[PDB]
């Protein structure tokens, strides 16, 4: 044989294309997999993970923290309309809630 | 004993790519693993339904692209489609 560099390096991705293809084949989704479906799929998953991680890292840096915790992920997801719509019916463990007090509840001048 | 596989190392590599000095806790890694598994299941189910609707037995990159367009919101789906198309083009042009 010869070297056998991985498919993820071929597609220029960090996510595992081979593991995604194996999960697609064994997930009982279709009879066959088209060999560009795992690459597309891994690219989409890596893009979503990178976007969420960038938002969480920005939220952590705003709080003077160098480590992302679930609160930062919840703040990143709930502060983005598209991300919140994508994860509208999802509960993040230990993420808390967004600070939001109604205007009527505040004291009047 | 046994062995359980997860997306922890890939999520850590993506984190070091987008934030070279920011770390992540174990609970955040579990949240990221659950998010990746949920998105994988959603896109795979949409692609499987799309293949079944058109009487096809193969899930291709077109089915994944249409599932991404159906499942994700607007600019998110557009950038995801761009990233997937770039990955597929680079993979085909490789070797």
């Amino acid at each position, epitope marked *: 044989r010869a070297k056998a560099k991985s498919r993820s390096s071929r597609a220029g991705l960090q996510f595992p294309v081979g593991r995604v293809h194996r999960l697609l084949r064994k997930g009982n989704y279709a009879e066959r997999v088209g060999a560009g479906a795992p690459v597309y799929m891994a690219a989409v998953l890596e893009y979503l993970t990178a976007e969420i991680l960038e938002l969480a890292g920005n939220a952590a840096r705003d709080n003077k923290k160098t480590r992302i915790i679930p609160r930062h992920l919840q703040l990143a997801i709930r502060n983005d*309309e598209e991300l919140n719509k994508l994860l509208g019916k999802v509960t993040i463990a230990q993420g808390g809630v967004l600070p939001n007090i109604q205007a009527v509840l505040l004291p009047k001048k | 004993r046994s062995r359980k596989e997860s997306y922890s190392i890939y999520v850590y590599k993506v984190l070091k790519q987008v934030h070279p000095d920011t770390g992540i806790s174990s609970k955040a890694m579990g949240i990221m693993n659950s998010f990746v598994n949920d998105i994988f299941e959603r896109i795979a189910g949409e692609a499987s339904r799309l293949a079944h609707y058109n009487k096809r037995s193969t899930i291709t990159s077109r089915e994944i692209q249409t599932a991404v367009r159906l499942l994700l919101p607007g600019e998110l789906a557009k*950038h995801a489609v761009s990233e997937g198309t770039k990955a597929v083009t680079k993979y085909t042009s490789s070797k």
Partner: single-chain antibody
Amino acid sequence: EVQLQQSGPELVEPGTSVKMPCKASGYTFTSYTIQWVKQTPRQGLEWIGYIYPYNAGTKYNEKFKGKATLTSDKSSSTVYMELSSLTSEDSAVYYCARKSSRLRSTLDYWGQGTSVTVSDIKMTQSPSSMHASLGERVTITCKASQDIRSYLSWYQQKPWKSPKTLIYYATSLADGVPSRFSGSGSGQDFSLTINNLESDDTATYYCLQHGESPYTFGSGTKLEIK
């Protein structure tokens, strides 16, 4: 489809305040942020700040902190900019632009802009002005003071017109832009290339970075044909 209607020209005496609207149409108003840019002959294009109508969160430039205030009205899909204490050095064109909340997205659609007349990372463009005929190749550089991971956009502005987006994310072509334009580079060195020239290519080309908290524009390169 997507458009941003702004107000007309304004004449203002010093010490007063002026409000400009940014009535948006053709898209989901809450899912995009509204950015505000100030253009002067003295300092070119400068980023003021932005407001997100989804949660009303705003972020202002440090030098514009207190100078300007951004407000949103979701009922009319309008974004208002309030400038208080109008200084004599405030006559300029104020553009309002649409930007997705995605980090990769850029300021894609711009308003016509409102002219007001009162009675960090450094971006370096190598060719300040260049001469080219109808069919040569054009190359401009947008060297970055710091490292920005491909968060660079290119804009073309005709004289007395709003800027137009060409390349976003330092390589991707904008919507409706021909494939003749091409962006390249990442990190600190970026290049914009026009393959063959055209009489419609006579305009000023700026490069904007949005990888850091204050968004900075380029110095500006002037392009004329023949």
